[PDB]
Amino acid sequence: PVHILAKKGEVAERVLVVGDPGRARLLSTLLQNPKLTNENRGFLVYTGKYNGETVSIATHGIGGPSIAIVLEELAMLGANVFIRYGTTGALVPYINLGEYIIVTGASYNQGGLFYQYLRDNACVASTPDFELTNKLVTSFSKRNLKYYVGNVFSSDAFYAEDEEFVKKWSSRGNIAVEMECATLFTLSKVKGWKSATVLVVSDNLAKEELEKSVMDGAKAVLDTLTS
Amino acid sequence: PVHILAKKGEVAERVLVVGDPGRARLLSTLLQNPKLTNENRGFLVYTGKYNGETVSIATHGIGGPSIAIVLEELAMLGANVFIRYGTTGALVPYINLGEYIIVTGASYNQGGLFYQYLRDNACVASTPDFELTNKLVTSFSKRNLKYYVGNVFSSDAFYAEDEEFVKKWSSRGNIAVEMECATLFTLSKVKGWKSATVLVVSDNLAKEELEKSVMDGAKAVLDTLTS
Amino acid sequence: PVHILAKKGEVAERVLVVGDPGRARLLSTLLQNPKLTNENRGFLVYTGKYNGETVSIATHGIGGPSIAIVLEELAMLGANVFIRYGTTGALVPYINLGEYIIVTGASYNQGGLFYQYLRDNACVASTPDFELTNKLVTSFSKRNLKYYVGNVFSSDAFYAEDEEFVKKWSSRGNIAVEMECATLFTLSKVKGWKSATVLVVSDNLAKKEELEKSVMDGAKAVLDTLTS
Amino acid sequence: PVHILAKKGEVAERVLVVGDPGRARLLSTLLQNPKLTNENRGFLVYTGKYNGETVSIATHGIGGPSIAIVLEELAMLGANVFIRYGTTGALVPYINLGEYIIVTGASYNQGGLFYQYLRDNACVASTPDFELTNKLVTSFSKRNLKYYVGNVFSSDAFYAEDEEFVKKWSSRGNIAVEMECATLFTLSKVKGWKSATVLVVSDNLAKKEELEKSVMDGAKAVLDTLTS
Amino acid sequence: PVHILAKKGEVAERVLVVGDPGRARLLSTLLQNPKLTNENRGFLVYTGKYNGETVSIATHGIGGPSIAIVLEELAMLGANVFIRYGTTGALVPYINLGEYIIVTGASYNQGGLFYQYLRDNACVASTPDFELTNKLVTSFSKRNLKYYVGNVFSSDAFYAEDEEFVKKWSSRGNIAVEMECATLFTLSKVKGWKSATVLVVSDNLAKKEELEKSVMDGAKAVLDTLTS
Amino acid sequence: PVHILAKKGEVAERVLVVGDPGRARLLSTLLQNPKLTNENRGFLVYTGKYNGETVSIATHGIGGPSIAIVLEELAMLGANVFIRYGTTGALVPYINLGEYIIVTGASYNQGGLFYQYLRDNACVASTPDFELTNKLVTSFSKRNLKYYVGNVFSSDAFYAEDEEFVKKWSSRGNIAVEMECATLFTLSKVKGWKSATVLVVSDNLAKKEELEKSVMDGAKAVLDTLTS
Put simply, whether E197 touches F (Cβ < 8 Å) is no
Element (H, E) at D132: helix D130-142
Put simply, whether A65 touches F (Cβ < 8 Å) is yes
Q: Is F6 helix (H, G, I), strand (E, B) or coil?
A: coil
Rounded distance between C-alpha atoms, residue A140 and residue A102, angstroms: 9
Rounded distance between C-alpha atoms, residue D95 and residue D204, angstroms: 7
Q: Is F139 helix (H, G, I), strand (E, B) or coil?
A: helix
Element (H, E) at C101: strand C100-107
Let me know: does D82 contact D191? Beta carbons within 8 Å: no
Let me know: does F198 contact F100? Beta carbons within 8 Å: yes
Is the Cβ pair C130, D123 closer than 8 Å? no
Chain D environment of C123 (Cβ under 8 Å): 107-110, 114, 123-124, 126, 182
CB pairs under 8 A between B and C: 136
Which phi and psi angles does D59 have, rounded to 5°?
A: -90, 135
Q: Is C45 helix (H, G, I), strand (E, B) or coil?
A: strand
Among candidate residues C17, E100, D120, E50, the one with its CA nearest the CA of residue B121: D120
In this structure, are strands E53-59 and E81-90 parallel, antiparallel, or unpaired? unpaired
Let me know: does C222 contact C110? Beta carbons within 8 Å: no
- The chain C residue lying nearest B43, using CA atoms, is C42
Is the Cβ pair F155, A21 closer than 8 Å? no
Torsion angle defined by CA atoms of residues B98, B103, B105 and B106, in that order, rounded to the nearest 10 degrees:
40
Distance of CA E87 to the CA centre of its chain: 9
Let me know: does C90 contact C176? Beta carbons within 8 Å: yes
Element (H, E) at F82: strand F81-90
Let me know: does F127 contact E125? Beta carbons within 8 Å: yes
Number of helical H runs and strand E runs in chain C: 7, 9
Put simply, whether D107 touches E (Cβ < 8 Å) is no
Q: Resolution (in Å) of the shown entry?
A: 1.8
Tell me the residue range of the domain where F185 lies: 1-228
Which phi and psi angles does A218 have, rounded to 5°?
A: -60, -35
In this structure, are strands B174-178 and C32-38 parallel, antiparallel, or unpaired? unpaired
Chain F environment of A157 (Cβ under 8 Å): 65, 68, 112-113, 116-117
Let me know: does C147 contact C222? Beta carbons within 8 Å: no
Put simply, whether A118 touches B (Cβ < 8 Å) is yes
Among candidate residues B30, B223, B84, the one with its CA nearest the CA of residue B141: B223
Is the Cβ pair F107, E122 closer than 8 Å? yes
Is the Cβ pair C157, B19 closer than 8 Å? no
Put simply, whether C158 touches B (Cβ < 8 Å) is yes
Rounded distance between C-alpha atoms, residue C55 and residue C226, angstroms: 8
Q: Mark D20-43 as b/e (b = at least 16 C-beta within 10 Å).
A: bbebbbbbbebbeebeebbbbbbb
Question: Any idea what the CATH number is for the domain that residue E4 is in?
Answer: 3.40.50.1580
Q: Give how far Cα F186 sits from Cα of A112, A187, E170, E172, F115, Å.
A: 15, 27, 13, 8, 11
Gaps after residue numbers in chain B (C–N over 2.5 angstroms): 207
Among candidate residues B59, B92, B75, the one with its CA nearest the CA of residue B177: B92
As beta bridge partners, residue B108 has A123
Is C3 annotated for ligand binding? yes
The secondary structure of residue F96, as a DSSP letter, is P
In this structure, are strands F100-107 and F147-154 parallel, antiparallel, or unpaired? parallel
The CA-to-CA distance between both ends of chain A, in Å, stands at 29
- The chain A residue lying nearest F109, using CA atoms, is A112
Smallest Cβ distance to F104: which of E109, E130, E174? E130
Rounded distance between C-alpha atoms, residue D200 and residue D176, angstroms: 10
Put simply, whether D65 touches C (Cβ < 8 Å) is no
Q: Is F179 exposed, middle or buried (0-12, 13-18, 19+ CB in 10 A)?
A: buried
Q: State how far residue F15 is from chain E, nearest Cα, in angstroms.
A: 21
Let me know: does F169 contact F123? Beta carbons within 8 Å: no
Spatial neighbors of D40 by CB under 8 A, at least 6 apart, are D3, D4, D5, E22
Rounded distance between C-alpha atoms, residue B129 and residue B197, angstroms: 10
Which phi and psi angles does A146 have, rounded to 5°?
A: -85, 115
Chain C environment of B21 (Cβ under 8 Å): 41-42
Degrees to nearest 5, angle at CA B80 with B75 and B86: 90
Torsion angle defined by CA atoms of residues F32, F36, F37 and F42, in that order, rounded to the nearest 10 degrees:
140
As beta bridge partners, residue E145 has none
Smallest Cβ distance to E65: which of D21, D22, D156? D156
Among candidate residues B155, B172, B151, the one with its CA nearest the CA of residue B105: B151
HEC string of A119-133 equals CCCCECCCCCCHHHH
Chain F environment of E106 (Cβ under 8 Å): 125
Spatial neighbors of E94 by CB under 8 A, at least 6 apart, are none
- The chain C residue lying nearest D175, using CA atoms, is C189
Q: State how far residue A88 is from chain F, nearest Cα, in angstroms.
A: 13
Chain D environment of C121 (Cβ under 8 Å): 109-110, 121
Smallest Cβ distance to B115: which of C64, C111, C114? C111
Smallest Cβ distance to E64: which of D63, D109, D159? D63
Is the Cβ pair C112, B179 closer than 8 Å? no
Is the Cβ pair A122, B172 closer than 8 Å? yes
Among candidate residues C134, C141, C136, C163, the one with its CA nearest the CA of residue C222: C136
Which phi and psi angles does D65 have, rounded to 5°?
A: -55, -45
CA torsion sign for C24, C29, C35, C36 is positive
Rounded distance between C-alpha atoms, residue C196 and residue C69, angstroms: 17
Q: Of how many residues is chain D composed?
A: 228
Let me know: does B55 contact B42? Beta carbons within 8 Å: no
Residue ranges with strand state E in chain D: 14-18, 32-38, 45-50, 53-59, 81-90, 100-107, 147-154, 174-178, 194-204
Is the Cβ pair F112, A21 closer than 8 Å? no
- Residue D226, amino acid: L
Let me know: does B15 contact B56? Beta carbons within 8 Å: yes
Element (H, E) at E67: helix E64-76
Q: Is D161 helix (H, G, I), strand (E, B) or coil?
A: coil
Let me know: does F223 contact F16? Beta carbons within 8 Å: yes
Residue C185 backbone class (left: φ over 0; alpha: ψ -120 to 50; beta: rest)? alpha
Binding site listing of D: 3, 19, 23, 41, 84-87, 161, 178-180, 202-203
Q: How many CB atoms lie under 10 A from the CB of residue F216?
A: 14
HEC string of chain A equals CCCCCCCCCCCCCEEEEECCHHHHHHHHHHCEEEEEEECHHHCCEEEEEECCEEEEEEECCCCHHHHHHHHHHHHHCCCCEEEEEEEEEECCCCCCCCCEEEEEEEEECCCHHHHHHHCCCCECCCCCCHHHHHHHHHHHHHCCCCEEEEEEEECCCCCCCCCCHHHHHHCCCEEEEECCHHHHHHHHHHHCCEEEEEEEEEEECCCCHHHHHHHHHHHHHHHHHCC
- The chain C residue lying nearest B107, using CA atoms, is C112
Among candidate residues E151, D107, C19, the one with its CA nearest the CA of residue F130: E151
Smallest Cβ distance to D125: which of C126, C149, C171? C126
Spatial neighbors of B123 by CB under 8 A, at least 6 apart, are A107, A108, A109, A110, A114, A123, A124, A126, A182, B110
Is the Cβ pair D65, E117 closer than 8 Å? no
Rounded distance between C-alpha atoms, residue E65 and residue D158, angstroms: 8
Q: State how far residue D91 is from chain C, nearest Cα, in angstroms.
A: 14
Put simply, whether A165 touches F (Cβ < 8 Å) is no
Distance of CA F153 to the CA centre of its chain: 13
Let me know: does D66 contact E66? Beta carbons within 8 Å: yes
Method used to determine the 3D structure: X-ray
Which residue out of D102, D113, D130, D167 would a mutagenesis test of the C interface target, given it has the greatest number of C Cβ atoms within 10 Å?
D130
Chain F environment of A117 (Cβ under 8 Å): 157, 160
Rounded distance between C-alpha atoms, residue C72 and residue A217, angstroms: 55
Rounded distance between C-alpha atoms, residue A102 and residue A132, angstroms: 11
Rounded distance between C-alpha atoms, residue A119 and residue A103, angstroms: 26
Smallest Cβ distance to E116: which of D72, D113, D156? D156
HEC string of B104-132 equals EEEEECCCHHHHHHHCCCCECCCCCCHHH
Chain D environment of C114 (Cβ under 8 Å): 123
Rounded distance between C-alpha atoms, residue E76 and residue E74, angstroms: 5
Let me know: does C126 contact D123? Beta carbons within 8 Å: yes
Among candidate residues A172, A211, A217, A171, the one with its CA nearest the CA of residue A196: A217
Distance of CA C197 to the CA centre of its chain: 5
In this structure, are strands C32-38 and C45-50 parallel, antiparallel, or unpaired? antiparallel
- Residue A161, amino acid: E
Q: At what angle do helices B130-142 and B209-225 cross, to 10 degrees?
A: 130
Rounded distance between C-alpha atoms, residue C194 and residue D16, angstroms: 31
Among candidate residues E184, E194, E204, the one with its CA nearest the CA of residue E105: E184
Degrees to nearest 5, angle at CA C171 with F121 and D110: 30
- The chain E residue lying nearest D121, using CA atoms, is E111
Q: Give how far Cα F40 sits from Cα of A203, B78, B169, Å.
A: 18, 52, 41
Q: Give how far Cα B76 sits from Cα of B10, C64, C161, Å.
A: 12, 24, 15
In this structure, are strands B194-204 and B100-107 parallel, antiparallel, or unpaired? antiparallel
Q: Please state the domain count of chain B.
A: 1
Let me know: does F23 contact A5? Beta carbons within 8 Å: no
HEC string of chain B equals CCCCCCCCCCCCCEEEEECCHHHHHHHHHHCEEEEEEECHHHCCEEEEEECCEEEEEEECCCCHHHHHHHHHHHHHCCCCEEEEEEEEEECCCCCCCCCEEEEEEEEECCCHHHHHHHCCCCECCCCCCHHHHHHHHHHHHHCCCCEEEEEEEECCCCCCCCCCHHHHHHCCCEEEEECCHHHHHHHHHHHCCEEEEEEEEEEECCCCHHHHHHHHHHHHHHHHHCC
Rounded distance between C-alpha atoms, residue B81 and residue B72, angstroms: 12
Distance of CA B167 to the CA centre of its chain: 24
Let me know: does A189 contact A124? Beta carbons within 8 Å: yes
The secondary structure of residue E143, as a DSSP letter, is T
Which phi and psi angles does D133 have, rounded to 5°?
A: -65, -40
Rounded distance between C-alpha atoms, residue F193 and residue F183, angstroms: 12
CA torsion sign for A207, A213, A214, A216 is negative
Rounded distance between C-alpha atoms, residue B132 and residue B137, angstroms: 9
Rounded distance between C-alpha atoms, residue F186 and residue E172, angstroms: 8
Gaps after residue numbers in chain F (C–N over 2.5 angstroms): 207
